[PDB]
Amino acid sequence: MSTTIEKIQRQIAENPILLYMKGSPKLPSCGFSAQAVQALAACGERFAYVDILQNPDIRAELPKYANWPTFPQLWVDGELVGGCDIVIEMYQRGELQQLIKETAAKYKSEEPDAE
């Protein structure tokens, strides 16, 4: 199929906790993700993130595969949650870290992200 999404899906799936945002050297979230990134790290533990508002190719095709025209978009166990607003809301909800915790714990050690 698409000579990048196939790779990307393998990548999203492999990463325990994944976040797509813009990884500018000055700011590793140069977009909307700027507010969301804070929430994720705040709610759970450490997470993996992919620069995409910066990469032209990846920015276009891959987001469309999940839902969004582009990003930010948050992925838990390689499954889309939502990047900009969704992260903040679910952050406040607590459910985000609930997912992250369980996912992080099952992928790594006893990651006590949420609790």
Side-chain angles (χ1 to χ4, degrees), residues 10-22:
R10 298 297 68 183
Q11 296 181 60
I12 305 186
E14 62 177 57
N15 292 300
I17 311 298
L18 195 57
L19 159 62
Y20 284 56
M21 52 184 181
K22 185 175 181 179

Side-chain angles (χ1 to χ4, degrees), residues 6 31 40 43 47 59 72 79 87 97 100 102 105:
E6 304 184 304
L40 212 189
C43 267
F47 61 74
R59 180 176 176 292
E79 298 186 60
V87 175
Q97 48 184 295
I100 299 298
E102 186 175 304

Side-chain angles (χ1 to χ4, degrees), residues 10-78:
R10 298 297 68 183
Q11 296 181 60
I12 305 186
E14 62 177 57
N15 292 300
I17 311 298
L18 195 57
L19 159 62
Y20 284 56
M21 52 184 181
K22 185 175 181 179
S24 300
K26 55 174 57 60
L27 202 178
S29 193
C30 188
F32 286 71
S33 49
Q35 87 287 295
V37 59
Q38 320 301 178
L40 212 189
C43 267
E45 284 293 356
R46 40 58 182 294
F47 61 74
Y49 85 77
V50 182
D51 56 299
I52 30 70
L53 298 338
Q54 180 276 167
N55 296 301
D57 301 64
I58 310 179
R59 180 176 176 292
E61 307 191 5
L62 141 66
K64 297 187 291 66
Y65 113 52
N67 178 56
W68 278 238
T70 55
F71 303 78
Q73 306 184 61
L74 183 287
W75 298 73
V76 180
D77 190 295

Side-chain angles (χ1 to χ4, degrees), residues 88-107:
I88 295 297
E89 184 180 302
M90 294 188 62
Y91 158 70
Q92 303 181 302
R93 301 294 294 295
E95 301 181 2
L96 184 165
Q97 48 184 295
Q98 286 298 303
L99 313 182
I100 299 298
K101 177 185 65 174
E102 186 175 304
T103 304
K106 53 90 67 172
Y107 284 101

